[PDB]
């Protein structure tokens, strides 16, 4: 037998040492991570918290996320136990950022200087700019529309169909939660459970990373990171920035260099909050490396940590929209 | 009302050749066709009903087939060639109309 | 493994059209469609078109819209190519091939001198 | 005993190797698929997912679909475990399609070219054109009418009787779900359960194929296909295009050639979405066969896959109605 | 012990081979059908489905129908397990039929010709003609009146008493279902259960036969018939037209000839729908008998089958009312 | 429609040097490239489809690679140097356009 203290359906020893799901003959079953057999088939090693039913505090458990016993509308990026699965809803409108400070100094200063005079205000409240509801998150909204009915708002989909039909401080009032039933494949929406009772936990226990590498659109992803103060948060597996980027934004390295659709990691700029920059700078000083891009594999992530990653070749503004770029790139 | 016609009314001399006695009706038939055997002015009786299955009192050498408007009865191994008229009756609707043919 | 055996030689009168044949016994003819391609000097190799034997449906190149007509006969399991308005520019070797261009026939090498 | 991990009432070994239902003396019982005994009596081999209670994610299970312990209003086409059972409701009106691109090029180009400049926009939202509610699906709607009371709307039936009594973007707001009770033959409608909580799962886990071979009417059928990304979706049996057509639209082959009421498969034209065309083209290139009609038995179906099949002899428009045809066919 | 897979309270072997209920000393108990003892006392052999709690899909089970543990308002004609027990409600008004085609040809043509140019449109929706609610069915309506309160509408009874107090497309909106309790003789009406959730199943699984042999009134009775497509429907016992008439309309044969109150079966005319006529004609051609009246014992009944039986000596109209008759019969 | 061009059409004399036969198309190709071998006016057949995998009837010494617009086939150990034209065919869209090359 196995202890499985978290009662997630996965043995805690497997959740610690690493585990993966493989199918032999159309039948799924968990197995401890074994090299030279699971790696060659593209299976991803999964690490979870042995004392948490859900590592990212989202309503879906580690077993449901990994084995596929989850709502099929959940984005594949959230199938990792260490990636939060929560909805983000919005309404020539585009996604916006609360405030930005970096931009007055050199764009290449992030290689040698981290934090200090550069920062970015982060607010968990949804916001948008103008000059139709869209779910840019990884979880659905079922029965309640937000404030700026049986149909849902699937992620990466608009509430009205495309064929059908200066700030907007959209509120985070979401609907109930669709929880997968264990006795049968049927999925039911628990009226008592609400998203508004789950979002605060995800915000507290996860580190938020925002990326705009595709279509110049800000995608909000959160990774379950370790908080040393809380003993339960320590049970989470160690998370590095390289691994967080690989499991959240689809970053891949074929030869030790992070790439995103052919774009190298050095092509992007890193922004941090006040506390995030202080923690990152402390880690850099302890590791004797002012440069951060080349030490990404040895930089640990903590809770209440916010990281903003932009594109260097585009010129940004206070609201984080690529209003302009360099002369060479716009010409060709 | 439903006129019954045969694609071939007289069989030319063709030894060791494919044999098929076909019937083309005025309109489509939902396989309600009957096949009739008769000796020389005697032994008048049917062999196949519903165009596929035998009367169960006759040997399996008779075999009918077809679908839609054209239905053909084939002979596996012919044993004799005499003057004996055949009949081709549909059963879709009144009145009952017969056909004709010359085999065996 | 697949081989196509044709006539060793053919005698024709001057300025007389000729038809090229290629047997397709190496596979099920009615299953895989057969393409036609020709190689000419100063223009490399240009695709002519393809024929689907089961229904006779064809697709032709923009250059070969009316240059050639492709048909087939299931009786002997072969396909035929007919060329109209023959001219000096039409003198080029044509080799047929199965779907995906996996199997190629043995096109003749015409030489006048 | 048998494992039956999915708890569907069918052994998982039977669900993998194939199974069928036969009656000896007015009594039904499952049996593993055995050739030369079950094939001659017309019984159809059934394959299901060993880890899913319902393979197609519809509220009816594999056991209920096969053994007949299902609501009798469900269309016989949905009795297969691999065919989804969900309602489609609409209102000289006729069914319409969102958008069409194919038609400018040759009608016979599908034999040698797949995708590229030809595609078709697909939207799961119901739509109709004009110049009365009709259920063209395979599942009933019981207590709630859609937005453009005890009686139901049976499939292939109008909400008012025939004796009784330019776009219509009908919404997918359906009613509750009539679930067959296991303790007795009585059927009861679960108020808590709703169709709107089941339709999204079916859309995500099934591949939609639209056919217009009868009465020039677009019928919407979905087949449970394998999604490699999700481990649970991999448990579904391998599905080919030939088998999907045979089990959904009634296609039959007496001599290796697919026919529909005497019409050969080559008489129909194949249309695909952008992702569908890319996947189909990848499979064709891997299999070394540009032609698709003759490799239908070796073309696998995946999730989120949309295929549109039309009639070649009819001329279609942007809304997919046979406005005209060839001169020869209209003359005779 | 006995298997009793259907959990109806009757052994499945008894339900297959036949069974009957007899009383020895004021005590009821089931017994397998034994000839020369049960036949002489007038007991009727009962056959049911071994895999169905209720053979006719009506809310009453086989045990309740046979043993008398049923609501006493249920008509005795519905006490047979193979006869559906569902209400029919209506309002010089009289019962009407949707449409009729037979009548232009000879009245005696049914002896030699079946189907083709003769048919009759059938609709399950209630209808009536004019120039007060009446229950012509076999089951009661308790708490909800239909659309064109504690008292009920008993079958063969008017909603108002007789002493008390051009089409009417009455809807099938009935009330709840009175289910007999097993722990005690008390009968209770289940609010959750509704007739509208049971009527569709009865329509799908039973064959409807309409008769007008008494008072020239159309009585609607349905008999549970075998559907070959559905494996569960195959579990029903084989039903012939002769047996269906005997168990539904009270037809009796003392010397091998069907009679109804002294009227021979040949005195009535048979009408069928399109599918019904096609199936009947196929059976007649297979059995080598164009005549149907003399092969009634070897004609099987299937699901979704509608049969209309009228009186030959009366002249009928499109609405199926005996507007006139022959000169001889009206004179005497 | 999709013009096919080769970065190198003639190979200069370079003994024991890196070998790469590249093809640059008019637009991007989703790895729908075919490689064709042919002896002296004989033995015309393909070797690699989808730019990566072999025909399975040919030895593994042939190995193609590439991504995007440029695809290059490399030779591990050359054994002969004769006059034999090569072909470079794309399969993205109609019509099928070939290429060229000189190796082996
Ligand atoms: Ca655990
Ligand atoms: Ca865990
Ligand atoms: Ca199972
Ligand atoms: Ca299953
Ligand atoms: Ca029983
Ligand atoms: Ca029973």
Curated annotation (Swiss-Prot), chains A, D, E:
Listed result of changing residue 232 to A: Decrease in heptamerization capability
Consequence when changing residue 111 to C: Loss of toxicity probably due to loss of capability to translocate LF
UniProt site (Alpha-clamp): 5, 14, 63, 182
Outcome following mutation: residue 11 to A: Decrease in the ability to bind to LF and partially toxic at high concentrations
Localization (cell): Host cell membrane; Host endosome membrane
Result after altering residue 29 to S: Does not affect significantly interaction with LF, while it impairs tranlocation of LF
Result, substituting residue 289 to V: In strain: BA1024, V770-NP1-R, Carbosap and Ferrara
Membrane-spanning residues: 100-111, 114-123
Region (Domain 3, heptamerization): 206-313
Effect of residue 254 to S: In strain: BA1024
Site (Cleavage): 112-113
Documented effect of changing residue 32 to S: Does not affect significantly interaction with LF
Residues given in the record as Ca(2+) 1 binding sites: 4, 6, 8, 10, 15
Stretch list, region Alpha-clamp: 29-37
Entry membrane topology: Multi-pass membrane protein
Domain of life: Bacteria
Outcome reported for the amino acid change (mutating residue 147 to C): Loss of capability to undergo conformational changes that lead to pore formation and translocation
Effect of residue 5 to A: Abolished interaction with LF
Binding site for Ca(2+) 2: 6, 8, 15, 49, 52, 62
Impact noted for substituting residue 53 to A: No effect on LF-binding ability and as toxic as the wild-type
Effect of residue 87 to A: Reduced toxicity in combination with lethal factor. Decreased membrane insertion and translocation of LF
Function field: Mature form that oligomerizes and forms a pore to translocate the enzymatic toxin components edema factor (EF) and lethal factor (LF) into the host cytosol. Following attachment to host cell receptors and cleavage by FURIN, homooligomerizes to form ring-shaped oligomers that are in a pre-pore conformation, and associates with EF and LF. Toxin-leaded complexes are then endocytosed in a clathrin-dependent process, followed by a conformational change of oligomerized PA-63 from the pre-pore to pore state, which is triggered by the low pH in the endosome.
Domain statement: To pass through this hydrophobic restriction, substrate proteins LF and EF need to be unfolded prior to translocation. The alpha-clamp consists in an amphipathic cleft between two adjacent PA protomers, which assists the unfolding of substrate proteins LF and EF. The alpha-clamp binds non-specifically to alpha-helices of substrate proteins LF and EF.
Subunit structure: Homooligomer; homooligomerizes to form homoheptamers (PA-63(7)) or homooctamers (PA-63(8)). PA-63(7) or PA-63(8) form ring-shaped oligomers that are in a pre-pore conformation, which do not penetrate the host membrane. PA-63(8) displays an enhanced stability, suggesting that this form circulates in the blood to reach and exert toxicity even in distant tissues. Interacts with lethal factor (LF) and edema factor (EF); can bind LF and EF simultaneously and interaction takes place following homooligomerization on the host cell membrane.
Protein's name in the database: Protective antigen PA-63
Biological classification of the source: Bacteria, Bacillati, Bacillota, Bacilli, Bacillales
Part of the whole protein covered: 203 to 643 of 764
